[PDB]
C-alpha cells in the first residue's frame, strides 16, 4: 500500500480509483461482458463494445450518465486498463483527440489481462 496525492485541482473522481475500477470489470458477474465479433477479416475473442463499457459504469453506479463514463472509460485506455480493437478506435487513440474513447457500439475493446487472441479469417478464393 502506498498513498500520496498531489496537485492543485483534480479532473478524475478522487472518490474513485481507475485501478480499482478495472478490477470490477475483470469480474465474471460483476464485470464487463465480452463477445466474439469479426471485423476487417479478423475474429477478436473476448472483446466488448464501447457503449457496453460506458453503461457498465452507469449501471454500477459509478457515473451519473453516459457522458460521465466517457472520462472514466477514456482514462482506462490511456493507462492501459483497456485496449482498442479495430481501425475504428485504433485510429482514435492515435489521432489528436483529448479522449481516445469513441463511446460507440461499433468500437471494440479488450483487457490487457483477458486471454485476447485475434484470428485472421481467410476468404474464399478461386483456382
The torsion angles phi and psi of 67, rounded to 5 degrees, stand at -45, -45
CATH classification at residue 60: 1.10.10.10
Structural domain range at position 69: 1-127
CA 35 to chain centroid: 13
Write the CA distances from 33 to 47, 101, 126, integer angstroms: 8, 18, 39
How far apart CA 91 and CA 97 sit, in angstroms, is 10
CB 86 within 8 A of CB 110: no
Q: Count of domains in the chain?
A: 1
How far apart CA 111 and CA 23 sit, in angstroms, is 10
Amino acid at each position: 500500500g502506498s498513498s500520496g496525492s498531489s496537485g492543485r485541482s483534480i479532473r478524475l473522481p478522487e472518490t474513485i480509483d481507475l485501478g480499482a475500477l478495472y478490477l470490477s470489470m475483470k469480474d465474471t458477474e460483476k464485470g464487463i461482458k465480452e463477445l466474439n465479433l469479426e471485423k476487417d477479416k479478423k475474429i477478436f475473442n473476448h472483446c466488448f463494445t464501447g457503449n457496453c463499457v460506458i453503461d457498465w459504469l452507469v449501471s454500477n453506479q459509478s457515473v451519473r450518465n453516459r457522458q460521465e463514463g466517457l472520462m472514466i472509460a477514456s482514462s482506462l485506455l490511456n493507462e492501459g486498463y483497456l485496449q482498442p480493437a479495430g481501425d475504428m478506435s485504433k485510429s482514435a487513440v492515435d489521432g489528436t483527440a483529448e479522449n481516445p474513447f469513441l463511446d460507440n457500439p461499433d468500437a471494440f475493446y479488450y483487457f490487457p489481462d483477458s486471454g485476447f487472441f485475434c484470428e485472421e479469417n481467410s476468404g474464399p478464393s478461386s483456382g
